[PDB]
Design a protein around this ligand. Structure first.
Ligand SMILES: CC(=O)N[C@H]1[C@H](O[C@H]2[C@H](O)[C@@H](O)CN[C@@H]2CO)O[C@H](CO)[C@@H](O[C@@H]2O[C@H](CO)[C@@H](O[C@@H]3O[C@H](CO)[C@@H](O)[C@H](O)[C@H]3NC(C)=O)[C@H](O)[C@H]2NC(C)=O)[C@@H]1O
Length: 128
């Protein structure tokens, strides 16, 4: 599923991400834009042998099990493929754990490089 921008904003809001750990909704929408282009099916492999999964590009070294990542920790206790669903519930539940683990949204590299410190509220412009 490729979410619309306001469509994703509404879903993230309904799941309680707006201001979760102090990160406004625009931060989360911006992160998803640059991590996955709003595509729930997005996957990308990394040099360490891990892969990123889904709308928020959750990493298989730390958070989910994909059966092929050395040193995996599976801290969200979930198969990585469940993070590719059209329903964002599992990704949101796991993201809440990730952002609570110490480093806040710095866990998301694209957020750090492209959203952090920018006018993120623009990502929710026009949304109801
Ligand atoms: C969303 C996500 O899964 N982010 C992880 C990120 O994934 C990137 C990928 O690296 C890129 O190539 C492409 N995109 C994705 C998404 O942007 O990958 C990072 C590197 O593996 C992960 O960062 C590590 O996260 C762990 C766990 O949170 C960090 O360990 C924690 O560190 C804090 C502070 O030092 C400490 O208090 C915690 O106790 C500790 N947790 C654990 C379980 O040990 C670790 O520092 C990060 N490493 C780096 C280099 O940032 C990121 O989660």
């Amino acid at each position: 599923k490729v979410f619309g921008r306001c469509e994703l904003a509404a879903a993230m809001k309904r799941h309680g991400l707006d201001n979760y750990r102090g990160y406004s909704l625009g931060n989360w929408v911006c992160a998803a834009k640059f991590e996955s282009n709003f595509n729930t099916q997005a996957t990308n492999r990394n040099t360490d042998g891990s892969t990123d999964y889904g709308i928020l590009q959750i990493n298989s070294r730390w958070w989910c099990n994909d059966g092929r990542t050395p040193g995996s920790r599976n801290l969200c206790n979930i198969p990585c493929s469940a993070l590719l669903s059209s329903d964002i519930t599992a990704s949101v539940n796991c993201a809440k754990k990730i952002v609570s683990d110490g480093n806040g949204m710095n866990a998301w590299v694209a957020w750090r490089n492209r959203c952090k410190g920018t006018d993120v509220q623009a990502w929710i412009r026009g949304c109801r």
